[PDB]
Amino acid sequence: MKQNINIGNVVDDGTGDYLRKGGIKINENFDELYYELGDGDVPYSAGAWKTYNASSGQTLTAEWGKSYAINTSSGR
Amino acid sequence: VGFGFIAITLLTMFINVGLTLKHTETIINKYKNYKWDSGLPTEYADRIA
């Protein structure tokens, strides 16, 4: 999303730094990049990861990707 | 002179426990602590070596 803030003086002693105020910033990042996938969770990166377990209900729901049933036997 | 007079025993321990319980010393030490509110410091001290 290419809009993110890096929080204030970065280095050493100084009188410069952010007022504890930063977290407000660091608060926003996690917001924004959570609003990245608002509900979304792709399987594709992990897509085959999950289902290997037996008879998996394997809820990916409301958002997520899940499954293989890789070795099968799964009746998945 | 007309009564039976038999002897029997009883024992009384009188355990004295309850000495001490002196609470010793109570000790408390204050903290400067850190919350995300924070805000402007006044100068600084120490902070590294």
Biggest beta sheet attributes of chain B: none
Q: Percent range for helical residues of chain B?
A: under 10%
Cα shape of chain B:
rod-shaped
Give the CA-CA distance, first to last residue of chain B: 98 Å
Q: Name the helix and strand elements of chain A from N-terminus to C-terminus, one letter apiece.
A: H
Q: Largest interface: which pair?
A: A-B, 6 and 9 residues
Report the helical percentage of chain A: 10-25%
Radius of gyration of chain A: 20 Å
How much strand content do the residues of chain A show?
under 5%
Instruction: Give the oligomeric state.
Output: part of a larger assembly
H/I helix tally of chain A:
1
- The radius of gyration computed from the alpha-carbon positions of chain B, rounded to a whole number of angstroms, is 34 Å
Family (chain A): Belongs to the T4likevirus baseplate wedge protein gp10 family.
Subcellular location (chain A): Virion
Protein name (chain A): Baseplate wedge protein gp10
Organism (chain A): Enterobacteria phage T4
Descriptive account of the structure:
The structure is cut from a larger assembly and holds chains A (76 residues) and B (49 residues). Chain A has one helix and no strands. Chain A is mostly helical. The longest helix of chain A is centred in the middle third of the chain and has 14 residues, at 22-35. Chain A is elongated. Chain B is largely without helices or strands and 49 residues long. Chain B is 0% helix and 0% strand. Chain B is rod-shaped and about 100 Å long. At the A-B interface, loops of A face loops of B.
